């Protein structure tokens with residue numbers, strides 16, 4: 001007795017190194033990479049709705065700066081905001097800048113609703129050389145610059161807008177800051193001016209801010225922008241003795257806010273993907289990625305490791 | 320591996336075995352052959368692809384989150400935001416690291432295990448007609464032509480047919 005039968009297993013010439021609990025380098029016959037480290041050099045316009053701000057960041061798009069009319073009515077899952085956006089209007093600031101940018105981005109649409117405010121005797125629709133629209137003096141097309149009547153008269157203003165609609169409203173309004181008391185007086189008569197905006201449930205008051213300021217777009221003046229959200233059943237009251245940059249109306253808020261914003265220079269292309277990083281879209285089934293912590297949509301999880309190999313076969317012991 | 324078959328009492332794998340993970344290699348009076356075992360192969364593959372499927376699909380469907388990049392320091396609120404994002408990334412990196420180490424240690428034990436199940440299965444078919452040589456091979460103590468071999472491989476070998484011949488060969 002002398003025939004022989006042997007039980008064995010396959011092997012290949014050169015396998016892949018993996019880690020276990022015990023060992024940092026075990027060679028197995030096959031493995032699969034679980035960390036995505038490649039991205040597309042473009043953003044995928046499908047199946048998520050991307051809106052490109054192009055020259056406007058979202059705050060300028062909301063205010064209605066020159067160059068941002070293409071954003072009117074826009075609806076998005078992800079607002080694409082370009083690093084090389086540029087101000088095209090009157091020099092401004094937003095005291096809670098990131099909070100407003102978040103609210104607009106989250107909300108996910110620019111659905112503006114015109115209302116008429118019957119401002120008393122004050123002159124409306126002020127414009128500026130720092131806000132040119134087709135080489136003509138203009139302004140944020142969502143705001144309304146008020147100044148004294150031609151016969152020096154900026155009376156106390158007192159208008160109310162009631163919300164009986166079935167959705168919350170976002171009013172964006174502002175306050176103008178002259179650089180001298182002489183400027184103050186020729187614009188708004190009174191000195192000091194002042195704005196106070198109120199709801200059933202809150203109240204705000206801004207004292208305008210006069211002083212020398214660096215020249216931005218050839219001006220020392222500024223506009224500080226604020227916002228007020230008005231729920232159904234609530235009301236908003238505007239009060240002015242000068243310096244108000246008034247709203248032309250309100251933006252609609254979605255009940256459910258599911259959208260967001262992504263700041264990147266990366267061009268929008270023709271691919272399909274539901275995962276967007278600021279370095280571009282990801283086209284992968286892997287459960288992890290090391291490309292960017294900034295990621296939006298249906299993404300692999302971001303991790304620090306550049307590689308994690310999952311064994312998909314047995315130990316490789318050739319010959 | 321926990322069972323000591325792969326890289327244990329089987330000293331190496333077979334590069335010539337290209338149509339399965341596990342199999343048989345024999346020598347009898349009329350020659351030598353190598354054939355795959357389908358059942359053992361399929362068992363190993365099924366348990367690994369199963370791993371892969373559970374793994375590859377997560378659901379991490381996130382939209383509005385927080386800012387993660389900053390130009391200039393602002394203090395308290397920004398520190399907290401950075402700290403939250405950095406804490407999150409470390410815990411997920413730890414999870415990924417542990418997950419792959421556990422899975423790989425398991426995968427290797429499963430494959431060593433299946434090699435051992437295959438060897439044990441054939442040992443049980445052979446009964447008193449063969450002796451374990453110690454290297455994953457059985458010495459068969461009776462004439463075993465190509466049809467006999469194939470009957471071991473396909474599970475139809477009947478040890479009674481050759482027992483008298485084998486018992487007599489083993490002990491005298």
Ligand SMILES: CC(=O)N[C@H]1[C@H]([C@H](O)[C@H](O)CO)O[C@@](O)(C(=O)O)C[C@@H]1O
Nearest residue numbers: 126127128129130137145147178219221
């Ligand atoms: C009167 C008015 O409302 N707008 C005028 C402004 C503003 O008074 C100042 O910018 C306020 O600081 O001044 C201009 O020279 C300008 O910037 O284009 C002319 C413009 O028509």
Ligand SMILES: *[C@@H]1O[C@H](CO)[C@@H](O)[C@H](O)[C@H]1NC(C)=O
Nearest residue numbers: 157158159160161236237238
């Ligand atoms: C204007 O103010 C008066 C009192 O100062 C108040 O009774 C009235 O409700 C206000 N009108 C509006 C439209 O808010």
Ligand SMILES: *[C@@H]1O[C@H](CO)[C@@H](O)[C@H](O)[C@H]1NC(C)=O
Nearest residue numbers: 037290291292304305306307
């Ligand atoms: C991601 O991993 C690759 C290697 O897998 C590495 O070369 C690259 O630098 C990593 N990227 C980052 C941003 O760490």
